[PDB]
């Protein structure tokens, strides 16, 4: 019990912490958010990916984070669950992961129907051959790329 | 200076004697936003002359 009477305030301080990060990506996600659908310079995107698969593998990268100090939590005793510091960060999470599942939803669905439009461009692309000079050409769509 | 859209500064190396030179190169890694027959090209600058 004489190290437990410590661990009951170190426990208070790790919960006010988890917060502070957990508010930081959300405030990071809202930002990021607007740049990801605007397809701006300088977006959460990093390096060479597509404009909807890079949102996706963003999303998880932050969900990830995330979800890795609640997987620790569950872990300590000492009735963690039943302080109603803990039920208020558990609340706040919920809210995140869900807006972060919305925005993968939307981004899956309007790929899905970009999709379909896609393979049929590939059917009738055939070969192109542009200029007065005759200089046929690869006609394969960057979208199909 | 007046290049086709900006030009990110892809990787950066110096010049293995001493620092003289700077070979920089240029590419954009963002995915099909480069532009159709943008400058391709990479230079090397010198610390005595940096204007071009």
Known sequence: PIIADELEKKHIVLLEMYKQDLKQVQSIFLEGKQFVDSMHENAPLFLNMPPIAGALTWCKSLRDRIQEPIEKLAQLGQGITEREEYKDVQKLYTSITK???????QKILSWEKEVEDSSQDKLKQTLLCKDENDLIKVNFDPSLV | ????????????????????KVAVSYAIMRFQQMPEKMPTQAYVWDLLNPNS
């Open chain 1, 99 to 105: 807006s972060i599942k919305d925005y993968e939803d």
């Open chain 2, 1 to 20: 200076e007046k290049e086709i859209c900006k030009r990110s500064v892809s990787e950066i190396s110096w010049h293995p004697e001493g620092p003289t």
